[PDB]
Design an enzyme around this catalytic site. Structure first.
Site, PDB file in Angstrom:
ATOM      1  CB  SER A  46      -4.571   1.466   3.581  1.00 51.40           C
ATOM      2  OG  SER A  46      -3.654   1.079   2.574  1.00 51.40           O
TER       3      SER A  46
ATOM      4  CE  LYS B 238      -4.868   2.018  -0.742  1.00 51.83           C
ATOM      5  NZ  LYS B 238      -4.281   0.670  -0.450  1.00 51.83           N
TER       6      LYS B 238
ATOM      7  CB  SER C  72      -1.065   0.009   1.101  1.00 47.64           C
ATOM      8  OG  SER C  72      -2.165  -0.761   0.654  1.00 47.64           O
TER       9      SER C  72
END
Ligand SMILES: [Mg+2]
Ligand SMILES: [Mg+2]
Ligand SMILES: [Mg+2]
Length: 466
Positions: free
Chosen positions: A298, A52, A49
């Protein structure tokens, strides 16, 4: 002072939890550009993640901190004396925060516009994006779970965290030997129920399992829930989020006194509609506000929708191929060297993603000097902060350490991959760091990550709150 830090980080990286692992660890003073620490910084690794970070920066570049998202309801013409229309379209243009309440409010507007009867059919139109629901290399065993929700331009987001393309399943025990009760939530009347679960004896073992078998829109419940157990609630994905949005809207219209005669299905506003009459609409909060639930928690769905929204803005194409090129070009235009970057999705769920720690730090520095720097930083988890909308995925990490309240960083963990990257403010400087770990075969090295961030907070001049 600098030499002490290097030895301490060296020592942290000798941890047994990192056995067989490769770790990109880079630390930079953002006031000068001084490299305080660098190990395997040019090494290509899966970000999970941490991807992101790249997606959010590009979204803020391409769309803007003020960007908002629209949803509309259209008929071929306005209702007349009889208050009738034929077919009706619910059209989504990529709002990742569209609630069931937002649907009720649009249903109210439809009724206030003079519609009393939808004589034809109700269509859910998600054609603003393509119909590619899942990234190629995503794993099908992950499909039932909220982080692996199907991607659509028209999707209902559940709860204050806005988890898209899911329903909330609640299983409640009955008397021992009787089937457990299954409530499918929003997907009642949409998803199919296969309830095989029983209520176990009081004090028996909880073995309840809630599934969506691959390639179906069936919620399959098996196992045993103890008679004295608390009800089990879980988020589960559905097939075709837009069709669930259609089903929910149908119910909202009826609820608001609008009779729907026909069926509910997928379909785009016909090309031969001369001048669609918009009977209801809704506008999301601005991207700056959306970033918070997106980055703090997230949210995988938000990242993918933002990628397809970038494709739309740059190319009129609501697709991963266009959106992902849009991300790369945006990052380049920001000053980021994108040589070490391989972009396969926006969320980081894809094992086809690659970054380097140097690139992450590069981005962290460029984002710091961007006009949107503040909305960017406000979106990041703050270590050890107890309010979930503030601490995010760092809410229960680094509490009672020098990092608490100070370190702003993005997380990212899956099998054999863990990452922590962000900023360390202090009476010295706003340090920027990236820690990317790949290849370990036990728990994710979160304590190793915490140890570095805490040493950095200490180096920066901070002390644990007592
Ligand atoms: Mg719009
Ligand atoms: Mg329902
Ligand atoms: Mg502190």
């Amino acid at each position: 002072r600098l030499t002490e830090l290097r030895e301490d980080i060296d020592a942290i990286l000798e941890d047994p939890a990192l056995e067989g692992a490769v770790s990109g660890v880079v630390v930079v003073d953002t006031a000068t550009g001084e490299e305080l620490y660098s190990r395997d910084g040019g090494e290509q690794l899966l970000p999970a993640s941490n991807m992101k970070l790249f997606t959010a920066a590009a979204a803020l570049e391409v769309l803007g901190a003020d960007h908002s998202f629209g949803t509309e309801v259209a008929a071929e013409s306005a209702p007349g004396r009889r208050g009738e229309v034929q077919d009706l379209y619910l059209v989504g243009r990529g709002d990742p925060t569209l609630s069931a309440e937002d649907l009720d409010a649009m249903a109210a507007e439809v009724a206030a516009s003079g519609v009393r009867t939808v004589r034809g059919d109700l269509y859910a139109d998600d054609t603003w994006f393509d119909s590619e629901r899942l990234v190629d290399d995503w794993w099908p065993e992950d499909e039932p779970y909220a982080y692996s929700a199907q991607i659509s331009a028209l999707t209902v987001a559940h709860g204050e965290r806005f988890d898209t393309g899911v329903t909330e399943v609640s299983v409640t025990p009955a008397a021992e030997g009787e089937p457990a009760d299954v409530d499918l939530g929003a997907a009642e009347g949409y998803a199919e129920l296969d309830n095989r679960a029983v209520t176990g004896a009081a004090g028996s073992a909880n073995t309840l399992v809630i599934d969506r078998p691959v390639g179906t829109n069936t919620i399959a419940v098996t196992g045993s829930l103890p008679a004295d157990a608390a009800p089990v609630t879980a988020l589960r994905t559905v097939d075709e989020p837009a069709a669930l949005a259609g089903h929910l809207f149908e119910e909202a219209l009826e609820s608001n006194g609008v009779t729907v005669k026909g069926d509910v299905g997928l379909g785009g506003v016909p090309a031969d509609w001369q001048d669609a009459e918009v009977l209801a609409d809704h506008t999301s909060a601005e991207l700056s506000e959306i970033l918070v639930p997106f980055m703090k928690f997230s949210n995988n769905g938000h990242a993918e929708m933002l990628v397809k929204s970038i494709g739309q803005e740059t190319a009129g194409a609501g697709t991963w191929d266009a959106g992902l090129v849009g991300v790369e070009e945006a990052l380049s235009g920001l000053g980021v060297d994108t040589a070490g970057l391989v972009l396969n999705d926006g969320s980081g769920l894809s094992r086809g993603n690659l970054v380097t720690a140097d690139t992450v730090v590069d981005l962290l520095g460029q984002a710091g000097s961007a006009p949107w720097a503040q909305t960017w930083s406000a979106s990041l988890p703050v270590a050890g902060e107890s309010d979930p909308f503030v601490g995010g995925t760092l809410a229960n990490r680094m509490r009672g350490t020098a990092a608490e309240g100070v370190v702003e960083a993005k997380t990212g963990t899956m099998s054999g991959v863990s990452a922590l990257s962000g900023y360390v403010p202090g009476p010295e400087g706003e340090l920027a760091f990236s820690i990317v770990n790949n290849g370990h075969s036990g728990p994710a090295p979160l304590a190793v990550q915490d140890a570095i961030a805490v040493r950095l907070a200490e180096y920066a001049g901070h002390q644990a709150p007592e």
